[PDB]
Structures are given as structure tokens and as C-alpha cells.
UniProtKB/Swiss-Prot annotation, chains A, B:
Species of provenance: Homo sapiens
Residues bearing PTM Phosphoserine: S98, S102, S105, S107
Name of protein: Superoxide dismutase [Cu-Zn]
InterPro entries xrefs: SOD-like_Cu/Zn_dom_sf, SOD_Cu/Zn_/chaperone, SOD_Cu/Zn_BS, SOD_Cu_Zn_dom
1-(tryptophan-3-yl)-tryptophan (Trp-Trp) (interchain with W-33), cross-linked positions: W32
Classification of source organism: Eukaryota, Metazoa, Chordata, Craniata, Vertebrata
Residues with a covalently attached lipid (S-palmitoyl cysteine): C6
Amino acid sequence: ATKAVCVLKGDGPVQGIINFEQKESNGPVKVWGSIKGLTEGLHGFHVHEFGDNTAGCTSAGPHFNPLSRKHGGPKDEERHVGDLGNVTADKDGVADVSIEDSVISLSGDHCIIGRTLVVHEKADDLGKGGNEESTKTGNAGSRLACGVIGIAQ
Amino acid sequence: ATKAVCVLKGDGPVQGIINFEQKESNGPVKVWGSIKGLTEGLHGFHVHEFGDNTAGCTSAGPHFNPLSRKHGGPKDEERHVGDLGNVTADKDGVADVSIEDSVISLSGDHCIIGRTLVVHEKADDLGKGGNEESTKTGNAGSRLACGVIGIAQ
Ligand SMILES: [Cu+2]
Ligand SMILES: [Cu+2]
Ligand SMILES: [Zn+2]
Ligand SMILES: [Zn+2]
């Protein structure tokens, strides 16, 4: 009955709280919460490798990718472990996050705990961009707000 | 060669960066870094249970204590896993942290990764206080600055 939580923060107005809940060690992880201060529309949303906030969000490194694969959408089989795809922001800048994912986990090889969650400038093209970069970052742009994923009560 | 890192931050002037490095899974963890904005003298210094920063440092919960023991100094056998004792601050407010500890770990049962590090108002009395509270918190007072412990490169 594992739970985790993460406080997203950054240099600008983007901030929020995102919760994690994995009922069973082998099972899927529900991800939910509310991010605000976001430019209206789609935003990239990924778990990055390092829980390092030394030099801001940049220190977090690249997309969490322990199985050494190419970038993709969450439904895609060929994806990064940390590729949680997009989150959608409404008029007044709020994004009411509600994802459910089976690749990430709060335990084991795929353990995201102690690593960084990151919301992004532009939308994640889910790897279907055609250019070189789309296969890596998703062309989702700069890092607006981020936070280290922590064990929750 | 597992490494971790943590950015200590808070409501007031206290801030800093603390590094972790465990060369071997079964071995001790070197803790080092630099905290500043500290009142001159001793300060309590502990790993708390939860990586929760929702409602500030208070969300972190109590001292990390999976073996259900009483508070103590780091050298004491009867201690909390997360009891790293004290850190010393010099005149100009700076505390050059350099601990080495064998109870905490960056892997397994004692895994501190994904949990919160916390620097304190007063000094930790290392459980020798005689009162009720010294057996729990170390009488080290309020939480000045804290941060979630994250996986580092
Ligand atoms: Cu990303
Ligand atoms: Cu403490
Ligand atoms: Zn990716
Ligand atoms: Zn304690």
C-alpha cells in the first residue's frame, strides 16, 4: 500500500503538488494532483533520472531511462520508463492531473522514488515528431517547474 | 558507488546543500556539504520519515525510525536510524558538515532515499536530556530548513 508525493516548484509562476499511489508492488501507479500557473494547453510531463536540485531543474538530468530505450508516449511500448506523456492546462492556468501508469513503479528496478518529476514548457510530441530531438526529449522544451519524488504517509 | 544529494531549504535564511556517498551496499555512508544562515553553535541534524514537503518541513513527520527504537546520539546503539546527531555552525553562520555513519543507508530496509533531511533550531541533546521529549525529538527544537533526499549522478 505504497504512497509517494512531490512538490513541483520553479523559477517562475508554475507550481503544484502531485501524488502517487501504488496499491500493489506488481501493479499500476495512480498519479494525481493539481499544477497551476501553466500556459493554456498541453504540457510535457516526465520523471527524470536524478533527484538532484543543485543547479535547479537542470540538475535532474535526462528522462528516466533504465532500459536504455527511445523516447515515446506512455501507451507506446518503446518508451522511457519516465515518459508519462502530457498534462492539460485549462484557461485559468490550472492542470488537474489524473494519470494511471503501469511502467513506472514505487518499488524495484523501475523505482521512481528519490528521482525528479518535471513539468515542461511545450507539449510532448510523444516521439512522433520526425526530428532527431523528438526521439530524446519529446520536443517538450524547457523545464518550468520540478521537484524530488518523496515517500509519503 | 551509490550517491545521493539533498537541497536544504526553508521559510527563513537557513539554506544549504548536503551530499551522500555509499561506496558499498553493505558499507558506511559519508555525508558532507555546507549549510549556512545558521545561528552560531550546535544544531540538530536528522533524517525524517517522509519525503513530504506539502505543508513545509512539518509534513516530513518524525525521526526515521523503522526499528521502533528510542531517540539517541549516532554513536549510541539505542538510536533512531535517522539520528545523525549534531552539526556545528561557526561565527558567520556557516556549518561545514562532514559526518560518516553506518546505521543509515542508500539501499534496502534502512534506505533514506526519498525521505527528508532536516536541520534544526537548537542542538540535539543526544537523548541524555532526562525529560520525556529528549527520548523522542532530542529537544532540538523547530525545523529551520529541510529537503527531500534524492538520487544523484
Ligand atoms: Cu521531461
Ligand atoms: Cu529532526
Ligand atoms: Zn522520454
Ligand atoms: Zn531521533
